[PDB]
Amino acid sequence: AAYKLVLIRHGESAWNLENRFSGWYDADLSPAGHEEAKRGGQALRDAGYEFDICFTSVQKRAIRTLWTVLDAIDQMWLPVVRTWRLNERHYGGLTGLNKAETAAKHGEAQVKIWRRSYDVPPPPMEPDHPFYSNISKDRRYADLTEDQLPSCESLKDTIARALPFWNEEIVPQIKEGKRVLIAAHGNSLRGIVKHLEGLSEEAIMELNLPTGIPIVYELDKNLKPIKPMQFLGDEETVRK
Amino acid sequence: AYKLVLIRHGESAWNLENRFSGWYDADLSPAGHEEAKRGGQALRDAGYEFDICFTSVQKRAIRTLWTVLDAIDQMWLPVVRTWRLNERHYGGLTGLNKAETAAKHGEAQVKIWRRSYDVPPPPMEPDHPFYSNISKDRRYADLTEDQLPSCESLKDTIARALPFWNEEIVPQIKEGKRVLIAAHGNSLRGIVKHLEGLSEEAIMELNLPTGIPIVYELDKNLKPIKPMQFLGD
Numbered sequence: 001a002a003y004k005l006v007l008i009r010h011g012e013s014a015w016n017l018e019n020r021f022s023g024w025y026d027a028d029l030s031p032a033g034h035e036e037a038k039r040g041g042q043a044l045r046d047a048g049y050e051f052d053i054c055f056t057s058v059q060k061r062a063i064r065t066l067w068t069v070l071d072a073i074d075q076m077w078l079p080v081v082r083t084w085r086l087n088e089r090h091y092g093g094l095t096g097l098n099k100a101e102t103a104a105k106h107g108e109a110q111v112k113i114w115r116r117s118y119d120v121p122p123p124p125m126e127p128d129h130p131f132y133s134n135i136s137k138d139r140r141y142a143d144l145t146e147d148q149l150p151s152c153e154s155l156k157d158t159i160a161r162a163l164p165f166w167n168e169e170i171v172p173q174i175k176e177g178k179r180v181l182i183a184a185h186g187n188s189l190r191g192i193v194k195h196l197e198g199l200s201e202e203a204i205m206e207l208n209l210p211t212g213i214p215i216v217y218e219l220d221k222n223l224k225p226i227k228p229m230q231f232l233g234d235e236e237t238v239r240k
Numbered sequence: 241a242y243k244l245v246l247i248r249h250g251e252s253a254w255n256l257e258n259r260f261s262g263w264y265d266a267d268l269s270p271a272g273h274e275e276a277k278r279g280g281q282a283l284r285d286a287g288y289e290f291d292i293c294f295t296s297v298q299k300r301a302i303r304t305l306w307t308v309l310d311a312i313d314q315m316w317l318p319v320v321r322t323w324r325l326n327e328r329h330y331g332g333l334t335g336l337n338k339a340e341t342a343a344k345h346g347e348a349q350v351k352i353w354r355r356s357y358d359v360p361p362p363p364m365e366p367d368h369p370f371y372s373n374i375s376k377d378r379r380y381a382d383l384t385e386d387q388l389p390s391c392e393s394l395k396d397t398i399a400r401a402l403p404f405w406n407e408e409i410v411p412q413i414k415e416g417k418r419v420l421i422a423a424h425g426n427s428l429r430g431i432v433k434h435l436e437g438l439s440e441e442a443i444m445e446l447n448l449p450t451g452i453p454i455v456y457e458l459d460k461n462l463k464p465i466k467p468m469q470f471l472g473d
């Protein structure tokens with residue numbers, strides 16, 4: 001191949017379990033989520049994968065997935081770059097609610113609309129929201145401009161703030177021939193996948209990336225995939 | 241007043257701290273890992289906040305940092321790794337206990353090596369079990385041939401650590417970044433010797449405790465305002 005690139009969605013989180021919308025809430029991995037990451041790492045190790053640089057978000061579910069993979073592959077010494085721009089989509093006022101609470105309050109017609117829409121954002125997270133201070137006042141976002149700090153995001157917004165990091169920080173590493181590992185989130189990784197494969201808005205919203213499973217890309221000199229993405233793992237986890 | 245915190249990793253596996261672990265990439269033992277947890281809890285209890293972290297490229301230091309950041313809920317922090325904060329490269333002595341060192345190289349050289357501030361140990365011979373494990377490890381592939389150590393005296397170690405402190409760490413402190421450094425006895429010695437203006441003799445007698453946060457208050461010139469303080473019960 002011309003360039004090798006590996007992507008991985010964080011393993012299952014404690015809130016994925018509860019079916020609670022996390023978004024920018026910094027939920028940790030569940031024990032099952034940790035094992036997923038560990039197994040993904042062992043799959044990367046059995047295949048003899050080597051990286052030169054790692055990108056991740058500022059969210060511990062992604063960072064811990066990266067740590068567990070680096071540990072399994074004996075590459076804890078690699079440089080690791082964190083950015084809010086790889087964060088999960090900001091779910092606004094839905095943050096902290098489970099799916100029952102969401103349906104109860106908004107009705108399933110509205111949930112379906114949000115679910116199937118590329119560019120309609122959920123309600124904004126406002127100053128009386130239970131997680132407002134927890135997220136908006138977190139010092140990790142202190143350097144964001146007023147315009148950059150979302151009160152909510154559509155998938156399109158998420159992708160819009162994710163791609164500039166890909167373009168400016170990841171692409172140059174790849175073109176240098178550095179072997180890149182990105183440990184992040186379903187929606188931030190969709191931005192990358194959509195961009196690589198030129199997927200439609202409809203198709204990307206159908207793309208469901210599984211937690212803790214390494215995704216492998218082989219790109220041409222124009223960073224276009226030469227073949228479709230491939231999942232790494234034992235034959236079972238791969239099939240499913 | 242600037243706040244700087246240092247932490248030295250604890251016990252590594254297979255008694256390797258007593259076997260010139262040096263540049264061999266030994267992991268923490270479970271006890272060494274627990275030390276890091278307790279160190280991290282102290283930092284949590286005290287409410288310490290950091291803005292950036294520095295560590296070596298050796299997993300025992302890196303795992304110490306990871307354990308600390310986890311404990312204080314600051315896993316989102318920027319982390320910078322450098323060979324320049326590595327332990328001393330002990331060359332041919334690496335992996336050997338005290339008896340084996342004496343038996344191999346004799347009591348004469350052994351005595352000199354132990355008390356000397358600037359006499360390097362001998363480099364690994366091609367039959368050393370760590371020979372290719374260390375010298376061909378790709379984490380050092382960017383090093384110039386003359387940057388790539390094969391064996392270091394304490395002086396050599398301090399001399400390649402201080403440029404990193406000056407060029408990379410000092411500027412972060414001056415802009416008010418709260419720095420955490422997780423590293424090794426000998427690389428931390430370099431930093432302490434420079435901060436406190438210690439002599440060769442004094443630094444070789446300074447044995448920094450492991451697994452415990454070492455706190456410095458620094459003035460505008462990065463000069464310590466008081467003796468190093470330890471956090472904990």
Ligand SMILES: O=C1c2ccccc2C(=O)c2c1cc(NS(=O)(=O)c1ccccc1O)c(O)c2O
Pocket residue numbers: 019020021098099102111114115122
């Ligand atoms: O409600 C949403 C949703 C709402 C607003 C924007 C995007 C989505 C969205 O993308 C989504 C949803 C539900 C489910 N299935 S679920 O009801 O079982 C569900 C799972 C986890 C959290 C909330 C759950 O409800 C999905 O698979 C989705 O991809």
Ligand SMILES: [Cl-]
Pocket residue numbers: 080319
């Ligand atoms: Cl890291």
